[PDB]
Symmetry: C4
């Protein structure tokens, strides 16, 4: 009967607790300033729910700084005591015994937001909503303080000016006509607008206005600098792509690069970006060593599994090693590659698309999916010639290995190399 701290139940329970804390924090200052039955009913509901939360905290698991995993109620009690329980215990104190200031301790429940703030941060767009909610909460608190100051100093404040403006001279303005204007002034002072309908006129209201101006200016600047940061990150991924494209284009325009090869270069650029997205796979590859290096290579190592029968006998390490050495060339139909006579160092294979090698207007080796063609290895020791040049009917998304690397790795295995040598099958051997 133990609850996991990362269980999805804790997520919805924390959502409920957060919403309840927001409700309390919003409703208590308004009640304090402007003011059985629903208020005490909701108070009792809140107290019972938070008591249930305090008790259920005694059962959930936790992660220690040293011990990654720790459970059972023997260790939760010592950790939870002598800690954040000081703030939480005073929050859930029900008493009836006006003197309504004692409910301000409920604001301490807002601390519960900060200690789980990390988990809410895994979404990126939620930051904007949380920041706007916090700004509205600060505005609400400042409006509460404004109204409190007005009431306490009015036993020519802003209350009389408000009564004059909207006709209700003194009766007086209603509670609704006294809270909307306070929040209006608070926003007009945090956003630095200053409409002039309501403005401080005494000696304490001006000091409060100065304090609000400073706090709001600081908070506004920092918050919307953060907003600019999140917005500019999302748009700056695309802006980095744009800068790469601009770099390529200015490099082209500086070196003339007439159209016929320039179109190949450009289209190569877009189609390559379609798969790489600017990310260099080698960087994240080198971060993960040994078998973790090849686990990424395992994802492109589904090519020759079903296209070679002796290939199925490979062990984990052998398969890893043969996977790590494959290279991938990307070329949409229209890009021609090396041909006979030149260096036939790399043994060209296929990954996707199709290959239609043309040996002097004769199509040979029509293979499309992870097939085995190429040149002999141990009998050449020389960059000879092939049947004909490569041709591009479909995408030339193909695999490559290297003569030296492949011969070295095939000399590496004592027995796996013998097994592969027992069945050296090639779909089309093009001399």
């Amino acid at each position: 009967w133990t609850i996991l701290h990362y269980s999805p139940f804790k997520a919805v329970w924390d959502w409920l607790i957060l919403l309840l804390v927001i409700y309390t924090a919003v409703f208590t200052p308004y009640s304090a300033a402007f003011l059985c039955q629903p208020l005490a009913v909701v108070d009792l509901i809140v107290d019972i729910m938070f008591i249930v939360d305090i008790l259920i905290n005694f059962r959930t698991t936790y992660v220690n700084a040293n011990e990654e995993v720790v459970s059972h109620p023997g260790r939760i009690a010592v950790h939870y005591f002598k800690g954040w329980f000081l703030i939480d215990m005073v929050a859930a104190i029900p008493f009836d015994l006006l003197i309504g200031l004692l409910k301000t301790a409920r604001l301490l429940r807002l601390v519960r937001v900060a200690r789980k703030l990390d988990r809410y941060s895994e979404y990126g767009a939620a930051v904007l909503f949380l920041l706007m909610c916090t700004f509205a909460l600060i505005a609400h608190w400042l409006a509460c303080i404004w109204y409190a100051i007005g009431n306490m100093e009015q036993p020519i404040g802003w209350l009389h000016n408000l009564g004059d403006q909207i006709g209700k001279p003194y009766g007086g303005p209603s509670i609704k006509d006294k809270y909307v204007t306070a929040l209006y002034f608070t926003f007009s002072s945090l956003t630095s607008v200053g409409f002039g309908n309501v403005s401080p006129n005494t000696n304490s209201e001006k000091i409060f206005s100065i304090c609000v101006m400073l706090i709001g200016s600081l908070m506004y600047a920092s918050i919307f600098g953060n907003v600019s940061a999140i917005i500019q990150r999302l748009y700056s991924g695309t802006a980095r792509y744009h800068t790469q494209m601009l770099r390529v284009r200015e490099f082209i325009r500086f070196h003339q690069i007439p159209n016929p090869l320039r179109q190949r270069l450009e289209e190569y650029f877009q189609h390559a970006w379609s798969y790489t997205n600017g990310i260099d796979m080698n960087a994240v590859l080198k971060g993960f060593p040994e078998c973790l290096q090849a686990d990424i290579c395992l994802h492109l190592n589904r090519s020759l599994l079903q296209h070679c029968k002796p290939f199925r006998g490979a062990t984990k390490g052998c398969l890893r090693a043969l996977a790590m050495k494959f290279k991938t060339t990307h070329a949409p139909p229209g890009d021609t590659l090396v041909h006979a006579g030149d260096l036939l160092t790399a043994l060209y294979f296929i990954s996707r698309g199709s290959i239609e090698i043309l040996r002097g207007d004769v199509v040979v080796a029509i293979l499309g999916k992870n097939d085995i063609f190429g040149e002999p290895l141990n009998l050449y020791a020389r960059p000879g010639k092939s049947n004909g040049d490569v041709r591009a009917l479909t995408y030339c998304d193909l695999h490559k290995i290297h003569r030296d690397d492949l011969l070295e790795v095939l000399d590496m295995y004592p027995e796996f190399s013998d097994h592969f040598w027992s069945s050296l099958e090639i779909t089309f051997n093009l001399r």
Copy 2:
């Protein structure tokens, strides 16, 4: 009778459609709030044009996520249905049957802007114009809402204050004197100015003012943060050049570096930047492999094509191989280079400018454009001596190859090396 989706006709057609959507979106809220004949004439024209657009969309091509190219009307119907047609179909519904709210569905045509937003996005300055137009559109909508609120609540609102200010007490202000002030207030509340001529005075106008203040503050911050971003990119290319220059100059000032060599170093810096612009060509070179690597090398591979007769017999692969190994040095007249006695490893060639090698006050090898001079290769195997030091009359923009690399590549070809050996011509052989 099929139209290409990337044809230039689609560009001007989408310009026309965009302008028409802007017209409708601007003119419908004003008509809704402040209000045969021209209005219905334009309405009919808009409906007919957008119906024509809907039908012509049934013929243009499209690009699938998987299939790069796909055409013919068999596949356009299934893709276009069950998609964005839901928003587009309701837009083009003409009916006469006041209740003018039903035209608000025309605002859905603005969605057509978003789905082609990428096609506008290659231009850099167009972002500013689009952002300003969107800001003006939001201001127009907020002014419309402001006027609607004023009219509905006035059967001491801002309308009476406006009538008092500009003398027309109530007749009343004209439609022109009622729309300019609303847009004025909307801008004075989005830009956070707050002049005080017009200001909310009731309980709904203040709530609307708070909402406008929040929305405008957020939009203003984000939009002009983006504006700052585009401005700082364009100015920060030059600022990056400035920082490179600052790095160079602080490095010079930290190490004294008296004038005689410092002027050479500096002038080298500016003239090198004039050609490279800070861009490292090797970085973009390595992005394109195999023949895509040498396509860039082909652009500087026009030196010995017209300056050597056996050079014309090279195949594409041989040409690529010989092009990839060339290096280029830039030195305007005034920079002296290596001379006799020292390592004559690299075989110095020419690319531009002119070379006037001086062998002890005797000028030899006066060659300017992609000429072949240097030292013998197979008979030295030793860094011997040359006729004299290099001299700089014109720019020393010259080619270089390496002894080891050149001998290895000339040993690489079985037959091309034999052909080149058959005609080993040098313009001036300087021992």
Copy 3:
């Protein structure tokens, strides 16, 4: 009887001097504008304290640009003279002899803040407090100038409007009711709010308002841009971690990467970040060469000190050499590594956690802390076979060395290698 310039006594003394300078700078303009006894008492105390500071400056040490360390009173006098003494000497001039402008020279003591500004600068949050204090000080000075202008021009200024607003027509407003409003206006003009209670009405007040608007706009923009900078650095460390996580997750989602290996990869990522924090240790390692390179390597060089007896005889250089070649792999229980049959190149050791090698359902070599197991070296010269695959009970935070590197280093030492060869002890030799 000499005081060190970096002694902690100087820290508290400079704190006291700074606080006294702030006191003087705050209190002198207010006295100048709005105005024995405590005023002269404090004046005398300030003068005496700053005289004591001037004399004690004649004894503290200093650091020359060329000479890092220099002391004794012979050299302090020549350096301190012909320097900043010109500003400091005029500050401490007591005279009684109204003409209260002569106290403005005390503002020169604020220069003492700038010359020790670096010593405050290691803290990060202190920048915010200093910036806010400077902003408040500028606001105070501008309020002083505003009140001075008002008084000098009033022998329909803002003073009469203030007297009208808060009822005290003219007696007149009190000194308290005349300073709060001036500072209020100064803040409402620096923050760009413009409430409208107090506003310039003459021809000099408008010029002053323009000057204040320009200065405040510039200072506000620069200061809160800096505030945004410090905020975004602290939050952008976490944002850089977030971007790394986003890169990893988009790379995973682009390549499918089903759950069974994806969970291993992810958990590897978080636990690796827990130890490296994104910092590449090799970068800072390469900054320090020779023995400074191995000092960092000495911190992980406490493994075999207590786990091998001949290991204690190593000199400092031998210890450095053996430490620099060790590698560390992190794998919490759940990650399997290379096994028998595959390349047993690296000699696997242990650093933390525990190792429970399983040789065909038989557990062998149960070693947890910096233990020595593996394979023989000189008798294989071949990647042979081990007892069984590695197993993960506890964290596989383990050391590794390389066959070639270890054999080369053991061939390097003439005598240390002989000593190690004399006692070649292995805790569990697994063939």
Copy 4:
């Protein structure tokens, strides 16, 4: 009788021309709106000076895009014609023949600022002054337009409100009391303050206010974003140093690193930064190839010139080669280095400071400035031992060479090596 375009005379002449253009641009709109004798006197002076400028432009040199250097009056006429002469010629047209609008063509002289804007940009702080001057100029133009609108529409505008506020009902306000308020309003609308003293009340003033609000908001945002950019660059050099220090400190705190070696590491960090300033010299070294690589190395190649007699016979290339291979170690007194028994690969030399090698409590080889000590080379072929460990009395800022590199380079020269071998002198040969 030709003037160089980069001569310092052109600098002061351009300063004078710029100041004159600023004078004209400031004074013409004010004269146009608010208005022999000084005005025509200054007009004649300006016309004569700009005619002199136009003629002197016919003699100065210029730089073509292709030709770096070009002079003589034959080529200046063709280039200067069909170009920017269209704007410049209309500027200098004197005529007497009110209709004062024709002087607006003088604003075209402001274009002269843009075409020489690059040369003013080599200073960094001048950007702030130029931006502030441009902002003031835009404010002046907008105030001019405001006053023009007011006068033309007043045959209840802002003029009547101004006359009411400052008591002069209508006579009317003076020209001084009509220009200060216009500029006041223009600044209060560009900075987004909105005091409320003067505010638009008609239907054209509100449109003008909207236009000014938009333009000023855009310009203000962009300009102070640039201001933030320049400020943050200068402070972000120090912030990058701070981030490097923080990286080092968090790396230390994560790995404990007790005090004794930690103080060495830290002090190493600061003293190394004292010379490197975070700049990696190798990066700028590799940018300059061949002899330009060694010219930087020439600046530290003043060590052994005066400390070795056969060293004076080195040629340019030999000296370059011997310079490029020297390494520099920096260590303040307190850092101990490698000693006898360990690898004596590097041949330790001296650059600055002093060296006091201690061979078992015996001080030997007391050499301080670029001296020659070390171990024999051709007779060891083995990492033997030295007399004693290195000791740090003064800064261990010393040179190093490598055994393999030094032996290879001394085998490289056929004759220079023979000359050096003829005199192989060592100040102190420590076995």
